[PDB]
């Protein structure tokens, strides 16, 4: 509606019998391949990402927001749990670190 791409803002400019809108849009580029899974199975319970996707780079699993590559360690802060890990299809296995354990306060 306001230009091709994810819309950020627009500036108007007068013309003799109409208007000229200068739409400013954000467009992604330089994409890359990754392997992913819908959930992680740890301790018999399934973990899902709060926001983003589980992205694997060949050997390690990470969480990353969907629209821009910024990998993070999978922790209890960015995932939520739901039931045992046998109903979801394509679940994979990996360690879900809890930041409270290493501190051991």
Ligand X SMILES: CC(=O)N[C@@H]1[C@@H](O)[C@H](O)[C@@H](CO)O[C@H]1O
For position 93 contacting other proteins by CB under 8 A, the verdict is: no
> Closest CB to ligand X among 33 and 101?
33
- Which range, of 11-19, 34-42, 68-76, 96-104, touches other proteins by CB under 8 A? 34-42
- Least distance to other proteins, CB of residue 75, Å: 18
For position 66 contacting ligand X by CB under 6 A, the verdict is: no
Task: Fill in the per-residue mask, 80 to 99: x = in contact with ligand X (CB under 6 A), - = not in contact.
Answer: -------------x------
Among 8, 24, 87, 100, interactor with other proteins by CB under 8 A: 87
- Residue 70 near residue 62, CB atoms below 8 Å: no
C-alpha angle 62-47-40 in degrees, rounded to nearest 5: 55
- Residue 11 near residue 20, CB atoms below 8 Å: no
**What tokens were used for 68?**
């821009």
- Which range, of 1-9, 10-18, 69-77, 94-102, touches other proteins by CB under 8 A? 1-9
For position 33 contacting ligand X by CB under 6 A, the verdict is: yes
Q: Which of 51, 36, 50 is nearest to 91 (CA)?
A: 36
């Amino acid at each position: 509606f306001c230009g091709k791409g994810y819309h950020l803002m627009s500036f108007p400019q007068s013309a003799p019998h109409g208007v000229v809108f200068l739409h400013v849009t954000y467009v992604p580029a330089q994409e890359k391949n990754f392997t992913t899974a819908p959930a992680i199975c740890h301790d018999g319970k399934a973990h899902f990402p709060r926001e983003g996707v589980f992205v694997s780079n060949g050997t390690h699993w990470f969480v990353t927001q969907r629209n821009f590559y910024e990998p993070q360690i999978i922790t209890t802060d960015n995932t939520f749990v739901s039931g045992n890990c046998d109903v979801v299809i394509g679940i994979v296995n990996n360690t879900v670190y809890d930041p409270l354990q290493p501190e051991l306060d």
